[PDB]
Amino acid sequence: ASMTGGQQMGRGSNEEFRPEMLQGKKVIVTGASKGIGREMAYHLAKMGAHVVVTARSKETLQKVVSHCLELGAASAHYIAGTMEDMTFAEQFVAQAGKLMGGLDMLILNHITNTSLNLFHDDIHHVRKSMEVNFLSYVVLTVAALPMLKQSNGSIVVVSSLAGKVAYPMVAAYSASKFALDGFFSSIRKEYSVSRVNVSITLCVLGLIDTETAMKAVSGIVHMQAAPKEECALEIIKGGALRQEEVYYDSSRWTTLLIRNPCRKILEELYSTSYNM
Amino acid sequence: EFRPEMLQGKKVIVTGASKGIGREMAYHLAKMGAHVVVTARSKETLQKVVSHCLELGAASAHYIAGTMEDMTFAEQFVAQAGKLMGGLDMLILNHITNTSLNLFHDDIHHVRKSMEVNFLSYVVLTVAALPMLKQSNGSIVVVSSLAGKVAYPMVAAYSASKFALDGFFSSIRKEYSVSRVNVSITLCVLGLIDTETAMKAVSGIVHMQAAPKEECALEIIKGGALRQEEVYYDSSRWTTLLIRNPCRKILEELYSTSY
Numbered sequence A: 001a002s003m004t005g006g007q008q009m010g011r012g013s014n015e016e017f018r019p020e021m022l023q024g025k026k027v028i029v030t031g032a033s034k035g036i037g038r039e040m041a042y043h044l045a046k047m048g049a050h051v052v053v054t055a056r057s058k059e060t061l062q063k064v065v066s067h068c069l070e071l072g073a074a075s076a077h078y079i080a081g082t083m084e085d086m087t088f089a090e091q092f093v094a095q096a097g098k099l100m101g102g103l104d105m106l107i108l109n110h111i112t113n114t115s116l117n118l119f120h121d122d123i124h125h126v127r128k129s130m131e132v133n134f135l136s137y138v139v140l141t142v143a144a145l146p147m148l149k150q151s152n153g154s155i156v157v158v159s160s161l162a163g164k165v166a167y168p169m170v171a172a173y174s175a176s177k178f179a180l181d182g183f184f185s186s187i188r189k190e191y192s193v194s195r196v197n198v199s200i201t202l203c204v205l206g207l208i209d210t211e212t213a214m215k216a217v218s219g220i221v222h223m224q225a226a227p228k229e230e231c232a233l234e235i236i237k238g239g240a241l242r243q244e245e246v247y248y249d250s251s252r253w254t255t256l257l258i259r260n261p262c263r264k265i266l267e268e269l270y271s272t273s274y275n276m
Numbered sequence B: 001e002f003r004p005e006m007l008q009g010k011k012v013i014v015t016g017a018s019k020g021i022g023r024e025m026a027y028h029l030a031k032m033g034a035h036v037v038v039t040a041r042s043k044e045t046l047q048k049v050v051s052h053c054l055e056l057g058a059a060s061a062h063y064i065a066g067t068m069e070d071m072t073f074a075e076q077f078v079a080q081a082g083k084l085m086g087g088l089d090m091l092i093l094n095h096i097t098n099t100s101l102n103l104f105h106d107d108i109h110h111v112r113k114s115m116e117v118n119f120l121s122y123v124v125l126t127v128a129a130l131p132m133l134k135q136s137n138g139s140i141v142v143v144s145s146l147a148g149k150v151a152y153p154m155v156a157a158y159s160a161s162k163f164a165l166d167g168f169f170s171s172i173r174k175e176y177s178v179s180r181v182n183v184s185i186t187l188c189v190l191g192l193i194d195t196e197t198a199m200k201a202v203s204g205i206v207h208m209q210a211a212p213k214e215e216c217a218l219e220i221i222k223g224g225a226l227r228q229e230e231v232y233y234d235s236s237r238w239t240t241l242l243i244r245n246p247c248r249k250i251l252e253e254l255y256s257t258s259y
Ligand SMILES: NC(=O)c1ccc[n+]([C@@H]2O[C@H](COP(=O)([O-])OP(=O)(O)OC[C@H]3O[C@@H](n4cnc5c(N)ncnc54)[C@H](OP(=O)(O)O)[C@@H]3O)[C@@H](O)[C@H]2O)c1
Pocket: A030, A031, A032, A033, A034, A035, A036, A037, A054, A055, A056, A057, A060, A081, A082, A083, A084, A108, A109, A110, A111, A112, A113, A132, A158, A159, A160, A161, A205, A206, A207, A208, A209, A210, A211, A212, A213
């Protein structure tokens, strides 16, 4: 332990993933009682990492923690509460970081319960989507940044194809996912010039075979769903490799067209438009 | 091709119209003979715009002062304006909360205020205006930015609110298409303009070739009247070439076959 030293990241480490990259890493996973969140928890447990999981259900989180330790998690803990409460979001991070003695990766995955419907007048759902899916993520980031700066850590933001392109029946949801891109892509550029060695991974996902998604699309949307296990891993891979964006969808056509080279070009052209 | 006669007698709302691009839009509409209801917080500055609008030949010109931080004011403003003009043909959403260029550290109050003013009030204003716009087969004009399409440092909260506008309004545009709601949605993606606020905020930080606010305001009205989905306005030739996302339109068309 004390007689041990070196680095997992060398030549090729920016390109090829190894589960050893997550060995002994301190990770937070939000919305981890089910779906992709729970699948990410499980993969991190297997890779030999420390985990602190959160969601509103204490019972469901207990089950995840139990199973997480069984898979070989360096440590597994939960803190239950709602991400509607900005005070809970802020203290959760400090309370979670106390448990692990720091933080290497912050996985922001939770969303407020959403169903497919046309927008008419539900301003409460518009506001709640902005608060839970976007604002809580900002609060969690502010609370986690001192620890991530110490560890030269990572922020992993779970977004959607609906956070890159427009879709009907998800206006409030899509607004909150687009906001994530605007916010986190802007601070990534600030961290670059301020030499803050905290990476930011935005994960653009298509349909995933989670219970919630399958029930929500039932009889409304007829689309191929990708497996939640592989999705969870691809998210962790991009985070560990410090990739700016991760794309995961069933369609070959999506993977080919989702990338925006012109955005990357426009963003480069203003390096020469910035003072000290 | 646009014609100023398209706005002749039209019932238009212009938000954030006491100065800059908003005031320039209020002036162009008055020249075209539209009925106008302008808003911002400054009663004095709005009076000057109304007077200068009636001076340019507006069919009618009114102002209602108040803050877009108050969702109740936003909702009631539309009904109030709708009572004044006897309906609505165009809703121009232009206001934003006062923003300066700074690195993000812990200002969650500015993140929340940016989402409330620059995004949420736009949604509130739209909900309140939609019955009238459905009657007139009207238009919604959303003033966004290049920072609402690409990432920029020192504007995290602002950029988040402009990206949110794209997500929201582009999604409801697709819903209006399938629900056969004949209300068009124009998202205006603007580059650096020569307004007092922007010229002051970029001073000693960034320099460019500031596009004129007069022409900008007209290009916004043009896109709205022509019912264009998106309007792009910037001084750079390279921006106009790279700003468009054809692959997004292609991907959006592929998922139309799934419901
Ligand atoms: N599923 C897909 O097809 C798909 C596609 C694209 C993107 N994504 C993204 O992937 C992520 C995970 O989706 P999923 O389908 O795996 O979700 P899921 O199975 O529905 O799980 C949602 C998780 O968030 C928690 N949560 C709900 N409300 C919350 C609140 N108020 N405060 C805190 N946590 C809350 C849930 O537990 P409690 O209810 O007990 O709180 C649960 O752990 C989301 O960011 C989603 O947008 C998924």
